[PDB]
Amino acid sequence: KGIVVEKVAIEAKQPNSAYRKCVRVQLIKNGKKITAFVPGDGCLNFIDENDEVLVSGFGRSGHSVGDLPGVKFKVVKVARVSLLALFKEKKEKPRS
Amino acid sequence: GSLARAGKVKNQTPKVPKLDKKKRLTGRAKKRQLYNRRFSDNG
Amino acid sequence: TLFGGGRTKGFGLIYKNVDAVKKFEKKYRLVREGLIDKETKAGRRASKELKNRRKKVRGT
Amino acid sequence: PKSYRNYSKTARNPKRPFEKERLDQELKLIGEYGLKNKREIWRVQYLLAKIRSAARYLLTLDEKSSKRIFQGEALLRRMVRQGLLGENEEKLDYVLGLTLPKLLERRLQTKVFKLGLAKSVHHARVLIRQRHIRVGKQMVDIPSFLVRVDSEKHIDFATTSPFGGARPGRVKRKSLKKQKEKTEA
RNA sequence: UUCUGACCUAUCAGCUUUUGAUGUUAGGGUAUUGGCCUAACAUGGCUAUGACGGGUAACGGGGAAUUAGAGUUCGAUUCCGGAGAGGGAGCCUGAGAAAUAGCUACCACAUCUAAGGAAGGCAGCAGGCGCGUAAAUUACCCAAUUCUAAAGAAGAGAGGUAGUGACAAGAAAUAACAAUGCAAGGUUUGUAUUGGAAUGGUGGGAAUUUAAAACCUUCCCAGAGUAACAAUUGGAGGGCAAGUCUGGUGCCAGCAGCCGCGGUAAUUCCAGCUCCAAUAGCGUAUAUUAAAAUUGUUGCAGUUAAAACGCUCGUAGUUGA
């Protein structure tokens, strides 16, 4: 569990063009800042600027994944609601 | 930063109602239907 | 009974006389029978009252 | 402390998910024997495989070996009880020869379909779940009961079933008709 | 107390002996042997076959997962044994204790107090806070299982029984069937109209079960047709089983384990439709085993791909007509 410090826009490696929406989170345990990936296009505005994210690994252990350089972690539940559940269809509660 | 164009495509697309349809089969019944549609009459 | 009915398995006892029934069976089994009623109903609040007691703190 | 009652997996997941030839074969097997899930096939497959493993171990051991003669005979006798091997065969290579349709052929639903009663494998399966069947002296609702040879002679209807002549018909319709007849008359 | 058996580390190589290290003698001490402890005397003991250190997110074993066979990882956790009761230390009683719901003190915490003083230790069971990725009722009962007693009859949060419980594991529904009409086959097999049977789930009552109740099972009433008593999850280029289907977007948004896809026909996005895999279970993450004969004893590679010491002698090692 960590808290969102800043919302960042990482640019891809050479063969692809996009701006990838990422989230800088400070883990509660150790006071460590890391950059985490957020799936889903509406999801950048599904986190507030001082919110609680539940962050996980990203399918590869510490290895960089796909386009993103330097991103080792992924957000999978926000405001203690599941990110995917909110995204998919709106099957579960919005932000309060 | 160039952040706030986010959510573009989902916002843009039309939204469609998901219709009715007669109950898709469970279980044995679904397996029997699959068996017929793949293997029986064909020839 | 066991599945599908028409059959019932149990366990039975036949004592020499009623005095034997008084002798060698415990109270719930007697209650189940209908020989005597269920006794005192304090439960484990009895334990709480017991531990409320401390010897020679009160005259009793 | 933890309970001393044991428990175990019935089945082993198949490995290599999408292998076409195997997949189509499994569907074909379902088509013939009326099973709900790939899981039913897998448990039966696992059961056969264990038998095959045991028999394989036994056949490695030498002839006249005391353990071998005892265990091999015992396993084979168990196969005879199950109805997997005929009378003429009595040797461990026919145990190895056991094969998955041959085992499915000993399901209770299959046995009913063969003997009659129902008009379809699917009809048999629902008939068994809806409590109409009896092995004689005992009643059962499990379509994955396997039939032993001495019990193939006593498949019947359940005596508390409609077909057994219990409560005889649809209460709703018969009452409605009787009430209407009394009112009308 | 004999013997024998262990993880990682040499960027830990000399350790141990004034302060007992190794031995001899004599004592003291112990329940008893003993440097166990005192005195006197020896000057030893251990070490590349890895001592002495350091690390361990290390209690040990019975065992567990994964294995074709070798194996590799795991073992707080049902049994056995050890250790400990906030941190250390010291004690009494008694057959048994350096005991923690015995005691004394200190330190670290901390409750009541009219301030003089007093009382305190949940890693028993509940329950709370905090920590967190991460975890249940301040339940009922001593009937069984056993224990303790001046032993039937008393006690026991030992223990049982429920409650919470998608941790795992097994069994198992979500229709079945006949008529017709249509479809394809040489009176058949398949599939849209109809329409009588079969039944749990469910509601109620019992019978029963039970320490007591609840559940289970069993029986009697009720009691499906859009059987709305409504199956989901994740997918559909390849790897990899299923779409060169229909709209929107237009290098953006995004997807994408990996290769890659997206710049106006997108077989990959966002939808819809269809199809597919598994199914009351199915996704995701992290760890771990196989796959890995990519740790290689079995069983690798070293001319050129990673890799023969510059060369020789040689001690330990291993191997030896």
Neighboring chain A residues of B11 at a CB cutoff of 8 Å: 42
Q: Looking up tokens 């290579």, which residue turns up? A: D93
Do residue D160 and residue C6 have CB atoms under 8 angstroms apart? Answer: yes
Q: Transcribe D93-148 into DSSP letters.
A: HHHHT--HHHHHTTBHHHHHHHHSSSSSHHHHHHHHHTT-EESSSSB---TT-B--
Check: CB of residue A53 under 8 Å from CB of residue A4: yes
Tokens standing for A54? 């539940």
Q: Which of D65-95 are b and which e, b meaning 16 or more Cβ less than 10 Å from the residue's Cβ?
A: eeebeebbeebbeebbebbbbeeeeeebebb
Q: Which residues pair with A2 in a beta bridge?
A: A27, A53
After which residues do gaps appear in chain C, with C to N over 2.5 Å? none
- List of residues 6+ apart from B34 with CB closer than 8 A: D27
Check: CB of residue D75 under 8 Å from CB of residue D50: no
Question: Can you tell me the distance from the alpha carbon of D171 to that of D178, in angstroms, rounded to the nearest whole number?
Answer: 10
What count of residues does chain B have? 43
What is the torsion angle, in degrees rounded to the nearest 10, for the CA atoms of residue D58, residue D60, residue D61 and residue D64?
90
DSSP 3-state of A19: strand
Phi, psi of A34 (to 5 degrees): -140, 160
Check: CB of residue A26 under 8 Å from CB of residue A3: yes
Tokens standing for B9? 């495509």
Neighbours of D180 (CB within 10 A): 10
- List of residues 6+ apart from D147 with CB closer than 8 A: D83, D106, D107, D108, D111, D155
Of D106, D73, D78, D71, which is closest to residue D91 (Cα–Cα)?
A: D73
∠ CA B21-B24-B27 to the nearest 5 degrees? 170
Question: Can you tell me the distance from the alpha carbon of D137 to that of B17, in angstroms, rounded to the nearest whole number?
Answer: 57
What is the torsion angle, in degrees rounded to the nearest 10, for the CA atoms of residue B36, residue B38, residue B41 and residue B42?
180
Resolution (A): 6.7
Question: Can you tell me the distance from the alpha carbon of A25 to that of A32, in angstroms, rounded to the nearest whole number?
Answer: 8
The experimental method behind these coordinates is cryo-EM
Distance from CA of B10 to the nearest CA of A (A): 7
Question: Can you tell me the distance from the alpha carbon of D53 to that of C43, in angstroms, rounded to the nearest whole number?
Answer: 58
Check: CB of residue A86 under 8 Å from CB of residue A92: yes
Question: Can you tell me the distance from the alpha carbon of A28 to that of A48, in angstroms, rounded to the nearest whole number?
Answer: 17
Nearest Cβ partner of C5 from D134, D140, D160?
Answer: D160
Cα→Cα distances C23→B33, C27, C31, D178, Å = 69, 11, 15, 59
Nearest Cβ partner of B34 from D27, D34, D122?
Answer: D27
Task: Give chain E positions with protein CB within 7 A.
Answer: 77-79, 131-134, 140-144, 152, 155-157, 159-160, 168-178, 183-185, 189-191, 196-200, 207-212, 217-223, 226-228, 230-234, 240-241, 247-249, 251-263, 269-274, 276-280, 284-287
Question: Can you tell me the distance from the alpha carbon of D49 to that of D14, in angstroms, rounded to the nearest whole number?
Answer: 13
What count of residues does chain C have? 60
For residue D99, how many C-alpha atoms fall within 13 Å in the half-sphere facing its CB? 5
**CA dihedral sign of residues D33, D38, D39, D44:** positive
Of A45, A6, A3, which is closest to residue A24 (Cα–Cα)?
A: A6
Neighboring chain B residues of D40 at a CB cutoff of 8 Å: none
Question: Can you tell me the distance from the alpha carbon of D56 to that of B22, in angstroms, rounded to the nearest whole number?
Answer: 51
Question: Can you tell me the distance from the alpha carbon of C52 to that of D149, in angstroms, rounded to the nearest whole number?
Answer: 70
Question: Can you tell me the distance from the alpha carbon of D121 to that of B34, in angstroms, rounded to the nearest whole number?
Answer: 16
Check: CB of residue D47 under 8 Å from CB of residue D11: no
Neighboring chain D residues of B25 at a CB cutoff of 8 Å: none
